[PDB]
Amino acid sequence: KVIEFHVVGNSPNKKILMWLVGLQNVFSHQLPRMPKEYITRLVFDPKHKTLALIKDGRVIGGICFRMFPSQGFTEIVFCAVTSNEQVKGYGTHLMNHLKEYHIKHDILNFLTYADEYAIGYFKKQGFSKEIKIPKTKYVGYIKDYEGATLMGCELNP
Amino acid sequence: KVIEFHVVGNSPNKKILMWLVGLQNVFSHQLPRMPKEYITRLVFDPKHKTLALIKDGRVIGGICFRMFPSQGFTEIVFCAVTSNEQVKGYGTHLMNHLKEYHIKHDILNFLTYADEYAIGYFKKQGFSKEIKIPKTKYVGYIKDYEGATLMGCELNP
Ligand SMILES: CC(C)(COP(=O)(O)OP(=O)(O)OC[C@H]1O[C@@H](n2cnc3c(N)ncnc32)[C@H](O)[C@@H]1OP(=O)(O)O)[C@@H](O)C(=O)NCCC(=O)NCCS
Numbered sequence A, B: 001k002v003i004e005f006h007v008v009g010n011s012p013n014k015k016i017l018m019w020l021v022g023l024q025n026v027f028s029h030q031l032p033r034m035p036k037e038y039i040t041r042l043v044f045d046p047k048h049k050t051l052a053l054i055k056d057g058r059v060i061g062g063i064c065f066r067m068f069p070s071q072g073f074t075e076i077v078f079c080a081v082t083s084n085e086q087v088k089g090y091g092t093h094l095m096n097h098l099k100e101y102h103i104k105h106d107i108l109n110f111l112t113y114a115d116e117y118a119i120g121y122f123k124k125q126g127f128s129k130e131i132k133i134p135k136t137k138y139v140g141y142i143k144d145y146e147g148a149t150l151m152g153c154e155l156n157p
């Protein structure tokens, strides 16, 4: 009934902090292959911001991303919608809003290492297994993950 | 292999933030009758401290308490051991160490509102149902918890 999108960050007021915990809680529930401590580390890392999906006070989704304005792309880390609220298009809205945030900041590229079970969702948001940014841009900067496949998205206007 | 006891709180240290979150996760998994956001609120509250049990870098247990020096007791909010590690004398250790901390701080009585299933566990730690510290001392200072049983016990030097 009321639904909000906030880019948040630990760079730490009381409200966002509740949201930061809520995001960590949402992520750890969906991403079973991610240890809670690791999520907490990245989520609270000041070089990472998280785009939070609030519904009626409560965090229900988010995308954790790290921007590399120098490389000309953004690494997408932990994106999740809570189980209740899956398949209602929330995840596509988050990616859309993420996409618009970045057009303003003039980063036109997304990179992520995709779980096997969610390659489907990224392909819908325009990601491809075939990457158009040269290796020399992201190798080293971006976290490689075990048996996740790397996908890119090249936004526009 | 390494096992630590730290008394923590929100009174921006990067270590204790991760610990406080790690504590919120453990408290949240183990106590269904308490909503995640409530736990977050109290855990990070500057009048609440928490006894963290770290194991090899990671929180596996804790006791959140609020000290009432002006009263003569300490109120026990949450305590829990992560599930891997239950039935290993870990929570007995935590409570023992909590007792020491408070003796060293001149607060002899512990109060808790105990939930239907851990009455067993508190009873062993000297805890009981009959309080010896006057109702007027704690009522309205402590937080009544619904269909929990109030309990209390004293600790020697
Ligand atoms: C993946 C996820 C973030 C998608 O959010 P969502 O709101 O549930 O999915 P949506 O409602 O936005 O639907 C998105 C589209 O991708 C599709 N899709 C393909 N594979 C999918 C998958 N594995 N999960 C969800 N949607 C998927 C949906 O059917 C939908 O297609 P359509 O609208 O064209 O018909 C969410 O389901 C989730 O939290 N999964 C668990 C954790 C995870 O796998 N994270 C990694 C990637 S974010």
Ligand SMILES: CC(C)(COP(=O)(O)OP(=O)(O)OC[C@H]1O[C@@H](n2cnc3c(N)ncnc32)[C@H](O)[C@@H]1OP(=O)(O)O)[C@@H](O)C(=O)NCCC(=O)NCCS
Pocket (backbone or CB within 6 Å): B030, B031, B078, B079, B080, B081, B082, B085, B086, B087, B088, B089, B090, B091, B092, B093, B117, B118, B120, B121, B122, B124
């Ligand atoms: C109850 C709890 C906090 C204790 O941690 P623990 O390490 O498993 O308990 P211990 O290993 O120290 O065992 C303590 C003694 O109390 C007993 N006990 C009573 N209830 C128990 C319970 N629910 N779980 C484990 N032990 C329990 C044990 O048998 C043990 O007896 P013994 O040493 O004489 O053989 C833990 O199981 C937990 O987190 N439960 C979920 C949430 C909860 O009940 N919190 C209550 C407030 S602390």
